[PDB]
Every structure is written in C-alpha cells, then in structure tokens.
Design an enzyme around this catalytic site. Structure first.
Site, PDB file in Angstrom:
ATOM      1  N   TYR A   1       1.942  -4.903  12.017  1.00  0.00           N
ATOM      2  CA  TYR A   1       1.771  -3.484  12.046  1.00  0.00           C
ATOM      3  C   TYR A   1       2.492  -2.950  12.989  1.00  0.00           C
ATOM      4  O   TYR A   1       3.171  -1.743  12.928  1.00  0.00           O
ATOM      5  CB  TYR A   1       0.256  -3.168  11.925  1.00  0.00           C
ATOM      6  CG  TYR A   1      -0.543  -3.514  10.703  1.00  0.00           C
ATOM      7  CD1 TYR A   1      -0.734  -4.626  10.372  1.00  0.00           C
ATOM      8  CD2 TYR A   1      -0.882  -2.518   9.726  1.00  0.00           C
ATOM      9  CE1 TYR A   1      -1.526  -4.964   9.304  1.00  0.00           C
ATOM     10  CE2 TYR A   1      -1.608  -2.873   8.738  1.00  0.00           C
ATOM     11  CZ  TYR A   1      -2.162  -3.981   8.688  1.00  0.00           C
ATOM     12  OH  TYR A   1      -2.584  -4.531   7.204  1.00  0.00           O
ATOM     13  N   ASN A  25     -10.012  -2.503   2.994  1.00  0.00           N
ATOM     14  CA  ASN A  25      -9.679  -2.610   1.689  1.00  0.00           C
ATOM     15  C   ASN A  25     -11.067  -2.098   0.910  1.00  0.00           C
ATOM     16  O   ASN A  25     -12.294  -2.093   1.654  1.00  0.00           O
ATOM     17  CB  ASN A  25      -9.280  -3.935   1.036  1.00  0.00           C
ATOM     18  CG  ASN A  25      -7.564  -4.148   1.249  1.00  0.00           C
ATOM     19  OD1 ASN A  25      -6.714  -3.247   1.422  1.00  0.00           O
ATOM     20  ND2 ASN A  25      -7.330  -5.395   1.434  1.00  0.00           N
ATOM     21  N   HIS A  67       0.775  -1.198  -0.123  1.00  0.00           N
ATOM     22  CA  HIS A  67       0.191   0.026   0.069  1.00  0.00           C
ATOM     23  C   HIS A  67       0.936   1.310   0.237  1.00  0.00           C
ATOM     24  O   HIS A  67       0.497   2.317   0.495  1.00  0.00           O
ATOM     25  CB  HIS A  67      -1.141   0.163   1.192  1.00  0.00           C
ATOM     26  CG  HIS A  67      -1.957  -1.162   1.270  1.00  0.00           C
ATOM     27  ND1 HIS A  67      -3.319  -0.984   0.829  1.00  0.00           N
ATOM     28  CD2 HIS A  67      -1.809  -2.542   1.474  1.00  0.00           C
ATOM     29  CE1 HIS A  67      -4.190  -2.128   0.882  1.00  0.00           C
ATOM     30  NE2 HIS A  67      -3.165  -2.943   1.351  1.00  0.00           N
TER      31      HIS A  67
HETATM   32  C1  HDD Z   1       0.910 -10.582   7.667  1.00  0.00           C
HETATM   33  C2  HDD Z   1       1.145  -9.273   7.122  1.00  0.00           C
HETATM   34  C3  HDD Z   1      -0.205  -8.778   6.476  1.00  0.00           C
HETATM   35  C4  HDD Z   1      -1.502  -9.275   6.230  1.00  0.00           C
HETATM   36  C5  HDD Z   1      -2.041 -10.769   6.265  1.00  0.00           C
HETATM   37  C6  HDD Z   1      -2.087  -8.153   5.933  1.00  0.00           C
HETATM   38  N1  HDD Z   1      -1.495  -6.954   5.997  1.00  0.00           N
HETATM   39 FE1  HDD Z   1      -2.114  -5.182   5.649  1.00  0.00          FE
HETATM   40  N2  HDD Z   1      -0.129  -4.215   6.034  1.00  0.00           N
HETATM   41  C7  HDD Z   1       0.978  -5.087   6.553  1.00  0.00           C
HETATM   42  C8  HDD Z   1       0.787  -6.389   6.605  1.00  0.00           C
HETATM   43  C9  HDD Z   1      -0.275  -7.247   6.405  1.00  0.00           C
HETATM   44  C10 HDD Z   1       2.068  -4.333   6.862  1.00  0.00           C
HETATM   45  C11 HDD Z   1       3.374  -4.753   6.145  1.00  0.00           C
HETATM   46  O1  HDD Z   1       2.374  -4.270   8.356  1.00  0.00           O
HETATM   47  C12 HDD Z   1       1.719  -2.926   6.419  1.00  0.00           C
HETATM   48  C13 HDD Z   1       2.740  -2.033   5.603  1.00  0.00           C
HETATM   49  C14 HDD Z   1       2.707  -0.757   6.025  1.00  0.00           C
HETATM   50  C15 HDD Z   1       2.089  -0.618   7.306  1.00  0.00           C
HETATM   51  O2  HDD Z   1       2.108   0.630   7.984  1.00  0.00           O
HETATM   52  O3  HDD Z   1       1.482  -1.794   7.735  1.00  0.00           O
HETATM   53  C16 HDD Z   1       0.376  -2.978   5.773  1.00  0.00           C
HETATM   54  C17 HDD Z   1      -0.415  -2.252   5.089  1.00  0.00           C
HETATM   55  C18 HDD Z   1      -2.035  -2.055   4.771  1.00  0.00           C
HETATM   56  C19 HDD Z   1      -2.600  -0.991   4.412  1.00  0.00           C
HETATM   57  C20 HDD Z   1      -2.130   0.483   4.328  1.00  0.00           C
HETATM   58  C21 HDD Z   1      -2.388   1.391   5.570  1.00  0.00           C
HETATM   59  C22 HDD Z   1      -1.888   2.889   5.124  1.00  0.00           C
HETATM   60  O4  HDD Z   1      -2.547   3.525   4.416  1.00  0.00           O
HETATM   61  O5  HDD Z   1      -1.004   3.257   5.629  1.00  0.00           O
HETATM   62  C23 HDD Z   1      -4.036  -1.137   4.334  1.00  0.00           C
HETATM   63  C24 HDD Z   1      -5.253  -0.259   3.925  1.00  0.00           C
HETATM   64  C25 HDD Z   1      -3.924  -2.490   4.612  1.00  0.00           C
HETATM   65  N3  HDD Z   1      -2.760  -3.131   4.835  1.00  0.00           N
HETATM   66  C26 HDD Z   1      -5.075  -3.415   4.671  1.00  0.00           C
HETATM   67  C27 HDD Z   1      -5.170  -5.130   4.949  1.00  0.00           C
HETATM   68  C28 HDD Z   1      -6.305  -5.855   4.798  1.00  0.00           C
HETATM   69  C29 HDD Z   1      -7.709  -5.407   4.389  1.00  0.00           C
HETATM   70  C30 HDD Z   1      -5.800  -7.224   5.048  1.00  0.00           C
HETATM   71  C31 HDD Z   1      -6.389  -8.350   5.044  1.00  0.00           C
HETATM   72  C32 HDD Z   1      -7.772  -8.577   5.404  1.00  0.00           C
HETATM   73  C33 HDD Z   1      -4.225  -6.971   5.176  1.00  0.00           C
HETATM   74  N4  HDD Z   1      -3.723  -5.707   5.163  1.00  0.00           N
HETATM   75  C34 HDD Z   1      -3.336  -8.046   5.745  1.00  0.00           C
END
Ligand code: HDD
Ligand code: HDD
Ligand SMILES: [Ca+2]
Ligand SMILES: [Ca+2]
Ligand SMILES: [Ca+2]
Ligand SMILES: [Ca+2]
Ligand SMILES: [Ca+2]
Ligand SMILES: [Ca+2]
Lengths: 675, 675
Positions: free
Chosen positions: B349, B135, B62
C-alpha cells in the site's frame, strides 16, 4: 516483425526473477514458522512491486475498446491520385492493427452503452506508420478542438459523485447539446441505431475530417475516408442493449474475438470521396467543417482496397491497451486540412501518450514500432531501449558525414505539406460564418431514416431527456430539436410533459441521402457468425434429437449454435440459468420442450418462456420446430402468422425459412409508431 | 467543510489560465478565418494539455468504488484496553472518510457484480491518520500476501482478450480456487448473498486480520474489527443483480449519495472481539490465519463507538479517486500480528501510491493530509508542496537543537511495537501446519445459512461453474467442493453434467455459528430510504389521485416514492420507458391503471406488467391498491393469498401491510429448492 522478437514463452522451465535468477513465489520468508515477514525477501518484493504497478492511466476518451491485427491490400496503383506508398501497387499488402471503442465510458464499462464508437486503424507501411483515427459516425459534435474538454466534461459523469457511467442521459450532457447547436448532427446519429451497433463488424469507419491526397508532382485533392463493412450494417434495440450491458459487458470484444478465431475475420472496403480543391465550398457547406457529410449523391465512393482483421492479440495489455494512435502519424502522399477540429487533434495525441506511457519513448513499444529503419537524433528519455551508435546527433554536422540526411519533396521520400496551401488575413479567434448552419444536415439525416427508425430515434431522445432533472434544460433541448424538426420536438415534448415551441422553418427541408439508414440498407449479405439459441430439455429424449438435427443444419451455414437445457450434458452448451435472449440473433424452441413454457430449482421462474418472449419483442426471428405446436406460440402470445415467426415440422424447411429471417435480422413491424 | 481550505469557487468571475491571466477558451487562434491553428495559441495548449493528462491509473484492485465523509464517536474511555487517542473518552469525535468498492472490476464496471467488497475507513485522529482497510467478508482467499497477484490474475479477465469483466465466472478463477483450497471459505461467502449486497449501507465491514490493542503499559490483546450495519443486512438475488448491472451500473454509489443528501446517512457500530495472547491457538485454528473467523459464540462483540457517514464529496476525483489508504497508517495503541497476509500488505500500500500519484508526495493530497502538525526530515520529491524552514533535516543534529525529537514508548506519544512480541526459529519459506484445515470453516458457514439461502449459494456455483469450458477444471472444482460438503458437490455436479466424487468426511460436521446468515438476520430495523414504485397511468385522472394519496402516506414514513406513468407531468417521476423492477424494493399498482396490464410507442410492449412480474419473482413485496386486484394479479400469475402480496381498498391499511413487507424485504417462499 517487432512483435516477434518480444514474444515470451513460459510453457516450460523454472520460475525466475526478471534478471534470470531461479526463485519461488508462493511463500514469504519469515523469522520462524509463525513469524513476521523479512525485509530481505527480494522474491516477495519484486513480485508485489510488479503487481502494485501493473495499471496505467486509461485513455482520456475511448477507454473501453478492443483490437485485432490484420492486413490491408490495395486494389490498384493509386499514384495518379496520391504518392502514398501503401497504395502504389495492385496487390500490395500492409499489416494493420485496429482498435474499436466507445467514447465516454471508463475501463470496465459496457460495450453496448449508447455512444459514438471509435474505429482506429494503423497501417505499418514501408514509408512509416500511418494512422486513420476514425469513428463509426461521419460527423463530430464540435467545430473547434479547443471545445473538446467542454464536450467531454459534459457527457462524462457529473464530477461531484461520478454518476452516470457511460451515458449521455443526464442534465450536463443535454445542457451542452442545447447550448452548443453544432452538436445536433452527431446527436441525431448517436440517438439512431448507430449509437448501439450489433458489433464492431457491423459498423463502418469514417475519418470524419476532410484530408488531402497529394501526388508526387505537388497537386492535391480533398478526400473523406470511408471504411464500408462487408458484413452489413446492423443495430441492437435499446431495451436489448440495456439488458446486454448487464448480462455481457464484453459482448462486442467477445464477438470480434470469436469471429477471428472461427476463420470469419471481418472485412471492410477502404474507400474515399475525392473532390477538387475548388469544391471546398461548392456543396452548400464548408469541407473544413467536421459537422457535415458530403452526401452520397454529390461525390461517389472510390474503393482503394481491402481491410481484413484475422489475428487476435497474444497479450491484451501489451498490444491493445498500449497501442498509441496519432493523426500525426502521416506519410508522404497525405496532408492535413485547416479543419479547426483536426488541427488541434494533432497536438493532443502526441501529448497524451506521455500521460499513458509515463515517459517519452512510447513509439518503442513493440505495437507502436514501425517496420522500417528509424534514423533520427532523438535521444535519451526514460525507458530508452535503443543504443545509438551515432555520437554526433545534430544537424548540420561533418563528424557523422551529414547523416541523417534531410528528407523533403525532392529527397528521401520526405513528407511535404501540400505546396498549394496558403493562409491570409488577421490572426483571429473567430468562427467562420460558413460553419453557422447547425440544423440542415441533422434534418437531412432524419429525413433519410425509415418511419420505424425515426420512431427509434424519437424514443431514444424521449428516454434520455425524460431523465434530465432541470425543466430549463429540457425547454432548451426542445428549442434546438425544433430547429431541426417541429415533428421531432412535438413527439419528444409529449413524453416529458412540456409543450414544443412553434415551428421555426428556417432550416426545414425534405431532402434525403442514401447510405445512412441501418433499417433501410436491406438484408445482411452474410449470416456467418450470427447466433442461434435452441431451447430444449433433458426431460424428453426426442427434444435433444430435435436439437442435434437443427444444430447440424445450422452449423453447416456458419451460424453459432447454442443448445440450452435445464442441465449440461453431451450436446448441450448452456443451462437455462445462464441463458438470455441478448445471447442470440434467433431463437428456436424444439416441440419436445413444450412443457417448460408455462418452476425449477435449476433456473429462475419463467426463464425458458422469457427468452422466447424477449427475442420476439426485440424483433428477432423466432420459431418452433416440431410441427403440432400452436402451444409455446400461444403461451408466448406470439402470432403464428407473424413476419419472422416460424412453425414447421420439417427441420430442413424450418432452417431454410429461419435463415432468411436471420438475414432480415430485425422484424420492425413489431414496434408501435406515434400517430 | 472538512477540506474547506482547499476549495475553489467558480460561481463568479472571468475565465483565467492557471496563472491568473484572463483568457477565452472557445475558439482556436488561426492564420485567417478559414486558416490553420497557430502554435503560439497558449490558451489552446494549456487547456488541452490539462485534458490530455486528466487520467491517473485505477487502483490495482478495488478500482470501482465510492466514498463519503463523516464522523466517528467513541462510546467510552477505552484506555483500559488501548492507548489509542481517538478511543480515549466518552463522546470523542474524529472525522472519517470511507470508500466502499468491488474488487476485480475496472473503474466503470457495474456496482452489482458478484464479488468481495471493500470497506476502507480513515480516522483523521488527533495522533495521526489511522486506516482500517477492510472487506464486507471476514475472511480472505489466501494465507500469504505473496499469492495476491496469483489470486488477482486468476479472477481478473483472461489477459489475451481481457474477458470477462468483473466476474469469477471463467476457467482461470475456478482453476485457482480448485488448486488453492484456502480459497474455499471466502468463495462460499462470495457465492452467498454477501457477494451481491443490496447496498453499501446494508453490509458489514471487517478488518479480516487479527490485530493487537496495546495499552500505555505495554500489555496487549488480540482483536478483530467488526463494523455492524445499523441498517440491517440485505442482498439482491442474482437475476436482479444482472439486470441492475445493465440498467444502473451506478446503483450502490447513487444509493449512498441519495441517503446522505436526504439526511439518512448510514451508520455502523464499530466493534471488536478481544481475546488474550494465550488464545492464539485455543479455538481449534490459528488467529494468524486470515481464512478463519472467531465464531460469535467463542468471543462476543464489544461496541467501541458509532461511525456515521453524512457528507458527500465536493469533487469525486480529488477526494474519492485520490484517497490513498494504507494499513501502515497505524497509531499508538494498535499493532500488527504475524499474519503473513497482513505482513505483506504493509509493503504494497506504501508502494502502489507511487504508481497512482506519479510521485512520492501523495500524503500532501488534501484527502490524504492529517489534521495535526507534521514534523519530519522528509524533503523534496516531485510535487513537493511544503516549504520547510528547518535547514538541518538530519538526526542527530545540534544546528536545529536536536529537533525534531524522537518519539517512542516513553516520550512524544510515539508508536511502539508491542513489547511482548518475539520471534524464534529458522528463517523459512514454509507454511505453518496450523493453517492446513481449509474446509471445516467453509462447512460451518454453509451449515449456518437457512435452506433457501443454501439453495442460492448452490445456484450461484451452478451458474459460474457451468460457464467453465475445461472438463478437468470442473472435475477439480467438484473435488474441492466435496471436501466441504458432499451434498453441495452432488447438487452442483447435477447442473454441469458430471458425477460428484464419493463423500470424503474428514472435515464434515454439523456445527453452526450465529450472525453470518442474511436471510436469517430478521426483518430490517428501518425501511427509511427503501424505494417504492407506484405504477399509474395518465389515461385515468383517478389513477393519478390514487398515486398522489399513496405518495403522501408513504413519504411520511421516509420511503422514496417513484410514481411511474406513460409520460411525465406534475406528480409523475418516471416514464415506463425508463422504469425497471431493479429500481424498486416494492411495487404498487393503482387499480385505476389496471388497463395497462394486458402496446404503446412510449414504452416497450408489456413493460408495465414486466415490472410487476419481475418484482414478484425477485421476492419483493408487491400489491394492488384500490380494491380491484384480480385483473392485475391474474395477468401477472400472482396469487392474491401469497405471502408479500397485498390487496386493499383502504390506502392506510394497504400502506400498513406493505411496510411490514418492506421490512421482511424478501419473500423466500417464491424460490424452488432441490429435492
Ligand atoms: C499483497 C497485496 C495485497 C494483499 C494480500 C491485499 N491487498 Fe488490498 N490492496 C492492495 C494490495 C493487497 C493494493 C494493491 O496495494 C491496493 C490497491 C489500491 C491501493 O490503494 O492499495 C489495495 C486495495 C484495497 C482496498 C481499496 C481501498 C480503497 O477504497 O481505496 C480495500 C478495501 C482492500 N484492498 C482490502 C484488502 C483486505 C481486506 C485484504 C486481506 C485481508 C487485502 N486487501 C489484501
Ligand atoms: C482536442 C482533443 C481531441 C479532439 C478534437 C478529438 N479527439 Fe480523439 N482522442 C483524443 C483527443 C481528441 C486523445 C485524448 O488524444 C485520445 C485519447 C487517447 C489517445 O490516444 O488520444 C483520443 C482518442 C481517440 C480514439 C481512440 C484510439 C484508440 O483506440 O486508442 C479515436 C478512435 C478517436 N480519438 C477519434 C476521434 C475522432 C473521429 C475525432 C473527431 C473527428 C476526435 N477523436 C476528436
Ligand atoms: Ca449531470
Ligand atoms: Ca435501428
Ligand atoms: Ca511518471
Ligand atoms: Ca513542407
Ligand atoms: Ca479464463
Ligand atoms: Ca441471500
């Protein structure tokens, strides 16, 4: 060599942790089958922690780029002009890595934005790593490194909303250009076809700054680096570039990758202009001024050797993303000049790798390592990968017998500052008056382009400046353009509804220089790697036979051939749904497919004809192969008698004409000129 | 205003260092006027060090996104279902910040890539920061968080060459989808119009996971978050999206920014489906399974309140780039579920902000701070901004009188785990059998789209899979598509030259569910902010009068009007050179400009007509205003009697018809269907 020992093969064997323990990584450990995940699941956490931490800061500029490995070969023993070891023998080979880039865009931005382009070459010499950190344009926007953040803030997105990506087409950029007149020369280059090159292989590389070549006897000469493309110079047209930014943001890195994979690794002649120290101020400007070129007619090119790129990375991140160039990576036989732009760069590149790497041991990354032994008293720091045996790392010492020894002009092939160099006068923060002519050389550049080329430049300016919201900035832009050329100012003014100011002829002249025109640099010297789309159909089995015949004849000559049809099958590379004119350097329709060029659930309305029309409008060689086919040409409004338009029944005659067209590359008669 | 305490004003005053010493920053300090730069120049080094270190790592996913501030207002006192403070009174207001995004692209990639989209909402509540990280699609590709790096490695660029950017259209992605069948449901959504939304304002937001609402008395309910757009749902068509990726990579962030600046801040109804704990496995699937929706017919939406975005950031980097969301930011009255995807996210996160921020004090960044007091024993770490007075930061203590006090279910309004939750059974790394049906809900989704919509989805799949080089992967893809729908598999197969496997009807059904269709969600409920391009000319003074009259009438109704002509002047917003059909939701030609629609140095050949043709083929309302239509409609091959094609002399009658067209938004009769 340092890369070899770090290659990791996972083509067999069982999954392990980073500490060699066999594990699984597909299901979390949980308290019951429908239960919560357990904290003790180390398999989960090592994997996710790795992932969570994959990203590193993008480079502050030149974020968007791509690289390849290769070889430099000296043509001679150059000891009579420089002590540099990598240039000291006919035939001597030195491994290289090169990274090409844009400037302003972030990671993920489009290769074919309009911008200055980076061309960064590392020579892993037998006397240390030597970097030439260059651009595809021989001059730079600013005259003092302290201005760099001002320049870069202005051209990067507005910092309230971060709009617009990878473009100078906004108020802030033109505010800066119009307020900092030094910018005029580079601006003219960036608004020419040099701002939108056809590929990294079809542009040159320039050190920009004057450097010094230093002989073993201490004498020195002033030099400019020029890397001259053996593929020829070539550009996109702007409308093509825009579409290509959306259809294939990876266009330049895919072009480079494919050329290397097909045995067509791109080549450059590494050259210098060499002049005496006494000529620093002989040419009507100052060689310490990075906004000026030495015109071809004032100092010829000397060819030093051959640069060839011939191997693609194994891991983009480890090699391309992590390569950390520095103009501070200098070797004996080369020295700096008092160019205030260069001088500040030396600081920047050492410092910025701390940001990128997150620690000081970035030269231990395999891509950054040298191919010779390292002897020094640098120690510790995060990520320290060496285990040093010398337990007395200070000078002077007796406890390690005085090792490591000092290297200098007379010992150990030490780097040394050119002994003739001197300084005199007050400690000042003042600009030399010798730097004050910001307009003559922009005019020299513009005078040296062909009429259609000048039109393209005017049209790029018209495009960008028309997007500037502030009337004051627009006026200010016209005031600066007018000092270069009244004509340019009049023509650009016409598009944005302002009057150009009265001619101010202080810096106007009619002189030209050779070697800066794309349009005027003649046909490409090779057509290998150029892309030919053949538009066909599955509806007529004769159309696929016509395509097959064409394929064989074109592929014989090293051209990359894409047969397009409604659907995939044997012989067909792409569907109409995925095809676009930006994908080809030339477009051929087979006669048998005439029916498509006038609806289908398999592709958007009018796609086959649109590819042909677009190719024609963007100046490309286009044709129909089959013979009775005023059709398709009629449907496309393309004149049969047009330059770069081909109609033959004979496949062999068609290909022979068409190939000359590919070499010509663009048919510029198709572009309207101002009165 | 919300982060007003942290604002720095530079609209007056003299340049200072970061420690308040007045300085200059335009010329380096040098040893003589043509001399080398001095190391003692602290002005130079602090400025360039700041610049060299501006960049931070992009988000791991993202990365490309944009954000705004606003307000959430509760419609009621919800204490009867949740103890959450921000929901405890009719009319209660809580500030919010929202960031929308793509998933796979890096930070300068195109807004209008085909992808899943993020919708992340922070509520700065009076009992702590509460984040719903959602999402625009209600289901996710995978059923366990440990798989996330597998998914994301597969869809992101191939790691040898880092190609292709921001796209699932390559071998690795479809290898993964075809080998991991859980992916089918989200894949179908991303291949629908939901993968290319018209704007952030025209999509919904979903928590995806089942969560719990917990009352003050310990009882709990299972909930899904739905954010329902008050602007209506709408999509681009794929060909449009591709061109828009090149013409305007910033399309979605510019759309959001402009809507806010014009007083048209987008709104959502924040809603839940609420079901009893006993319904976890009542609906034919598992509520812990994030690949499943609760069909609208099985559990209605309850509207909790209104989310409105109405203020743009002051500094993108400080606010948008640095906002660090976490599902771990939970408040009393909400709890987690044993969803193995959710469970793992909680780790990720918290950890990943260490990478982004470079230090552990990331919650002290202004955008991350809460709006209530912090009392805890966390201390030190790099970037520590607080100066803590309690010198006994341990529990239990007598030397600080036992402060801070422990908060729990019975005191201090402590968060508490839902007391009814339990675990039972072995500690396993096994998938629940309740998660095994990967195909029924993809089929439900597909059955619920209109025929043209189903065609679009098929055409997206045809586009992507045709770009996959491996025949084995393509076969494997067809095997999985076939388990959802034989018809889909046959139709996709037709484009890529393979036979679809024989029907396997285990999971085939004809059930439908309401609310997942874009095409079928009726006319837009408001047309404010929609873009109308008026194509005019400077050659005819009547054409500009016709444009001006249209402007007044259309602007009255809140539409954003762009008058286009050859050149800029009063009343003309854009030149033909910069205009494109991707810039408008509707296109109007004034009949005084009819002459343009059949060459100029001021724009590329055929540009005026290309805008009209493209708008028509992409399904937009198009028209000619003045009463002489046939010349423009003939040249464009647009039928006068066509749905969404308008010809009127009367300005008022033209606008009234055209506005109904804008509401319809797309005229889908103009897209061909498979037999
Ligand atoms: C196991 C790791 C993992 C899993 C299964 C998910 N995510 Fe995630 N997501 C992350 C690891 C992650 C992260 C790597 O930790 C991020 C990257 C940047 C941040 O701040 O968190 C991220 C970013 C991130 C962002 C951007 C937030 C922003 O604008 O800063 C959104 C909207 C989502 N995710 C939504 C989801 C949804 C709806 C998921 C499943 C239902 C989801 N993610 C599963
Ligand atoms: C005072 C700062 C400053 C100034 C005046 C310049 N640059 Fe620079 N340049 C940087 C500061 C910098 C940097 C911040 O230090 C970068 C970003 C990442 C890196 O390694 O250095 C950089 C990167 C960078 C790269 C990318 C190398 C790569 O692919 O990794 C190239 C090709 C150049 N620059 C070329 C130039 C040329 C030809 C310049 C003027 C003649 C120039 N830079 C002036
Ligand atoms: Ca700006
Ligand atoms: Ca050109
Ligand atoms: Ca660090
Ligand atoms: Ca020395
Ligand atoms: Ca791949
Ligand atoms: Ca749609």
């Amino acid at each position: 060599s340092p890369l070899a020992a770090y290659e990791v093969d996972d083509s067999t064997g069982y999954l392990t942790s980073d500490v060699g323990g066999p594990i699984q990584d597909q299901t979390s450990l949980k308290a019951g089958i429908r239960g919560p995940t357990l904290l003790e699941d180390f398999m989960f956490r090592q994997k996710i922690q790795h992932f969570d931490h994959e990203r590193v800061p993008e480079r502050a500029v030149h974020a968007r780029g791509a690289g390849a490995h290769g070889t430099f070969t000296s043509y001679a023993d150059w000891s009579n002009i420089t002590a540099a070891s990598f240039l000291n023998a006919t035939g001597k080979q030195t491994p290289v890595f090169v990274r090409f880039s844009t400037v302003a865009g972030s990671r993920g931005s489009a290769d074919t934005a309009r911008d200055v382009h980076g061309f960064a070459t590392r020579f892993y010499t037998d006397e240390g790593n030597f970097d030439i950190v260059g651009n595809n344009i021989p001059v730079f926007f600013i005259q003092d490194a302290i201005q760099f953040p001002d320049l870069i803030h202005s051209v990067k997105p507005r910092p309230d909303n971060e709009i617009p990506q990878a473009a100078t087409a906004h108020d802030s950029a033109w505010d800066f250009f119009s307020q900092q007149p030094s910018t005029m020369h580079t601006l003219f280059w960036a608004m020419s076809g040099h701002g939108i090159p056809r590929s990294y292989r079809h542009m040159d590389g320039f050190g920009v700054h004057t450097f010094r070549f230093v002989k073993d006897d201490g004498s020195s000469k002033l030099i400019k680096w020029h890397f001259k493309s053996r593929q020829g110079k070539a550009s996109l047209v702007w409308e093509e570039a825009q579409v290509l930014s959306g259809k294939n943001a990876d266009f330049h890195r895919q072009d480079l990758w494919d050329a290397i994979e097909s045995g067509n690794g791109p080549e450059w002649d590494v050259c210098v202009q060499i002049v005496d120290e006494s000529q620093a101020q002989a040419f009507g400007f100052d060689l310490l001024d990075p906004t000026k070129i030495i015109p071809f007619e004032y100092a010829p090119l000397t060819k030093l050797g051959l640069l060839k790129l011939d191997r693609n990375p194994t891991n983009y991140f480890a090699e391309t993303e992590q390569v950390m160039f520095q103009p501070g990576h200098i070797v004996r036989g080369i020295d700096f000049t008092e160019d205030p732009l260069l001088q500040g760069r030396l600081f920047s590149y050492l410092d910025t790798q701390l940001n990128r790497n997150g620690g000081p041991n970035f030269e231990q990354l395999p891509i950054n390592m040298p191919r010779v032994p390292i002897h020094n008293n640098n120690r510790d720091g995060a990520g320290q990968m060496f285990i040093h045996r010398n337990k007395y790392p200070y000078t002077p010492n007796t406890l390690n017998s005085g090792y490591p020894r000092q290297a200098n002009q007379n010992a150990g092939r030490g780097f040394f500052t050119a002994p003739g160099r001197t300084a005199s006068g007050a400690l000042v923060r003042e600009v030399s008056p010798t730097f004050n002519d910001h307009w003559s050389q922009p005019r020299l550049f513009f005078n040296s382009l062909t009429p259609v080329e000048q039109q393209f430049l005017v049209n790029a300016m018209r495009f960008e400046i028309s997007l500037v919201k502030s009337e004051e900035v627009k006026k200010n832009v016209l005031t600066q353009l007018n000092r270069v050329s009244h004509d340019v100012a009049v023509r650009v003014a016409a598009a944005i509804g302002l009057g150009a100011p009265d001619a101010d002829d202080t810096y106007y002249h009619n002189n030209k220089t050779a070697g800066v025109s794309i349009v005027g640099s003649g046909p490409l010297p090779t057509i290998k790697t150029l892309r030919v789309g053949i538009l066909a159909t599955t509806s007529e089995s004769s159309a696929l036979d016509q395509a097959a015949q064409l394929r064989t004849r074109l592929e014989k000559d090293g051209l990359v051939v894409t047969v397009v049809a409604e659907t995939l099958r044997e012989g067909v590379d792409q569907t109409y749904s995925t095809a676009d004119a930006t994908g080809f350097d030339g477009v051929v329709v087979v006669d048998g497919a005439a029916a498509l060029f006038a609806s289908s659930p398999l592709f958007p309305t009018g796609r086959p004809l649109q590819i042909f029309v677009d190719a024609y409008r963007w100046g490309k060689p286009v044709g129909v192969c089959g013979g009775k086919s005023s059709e398709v040409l009629d449907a496309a409004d393309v004149p049969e008698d047009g330059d770069g338009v081909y109609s033959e029944e004979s496949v062999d005659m068609f290909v022979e004409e068409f190939e000359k067209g590919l070499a010509t590359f663009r048919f510029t008669d198709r572009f309207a000129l101002d009165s």
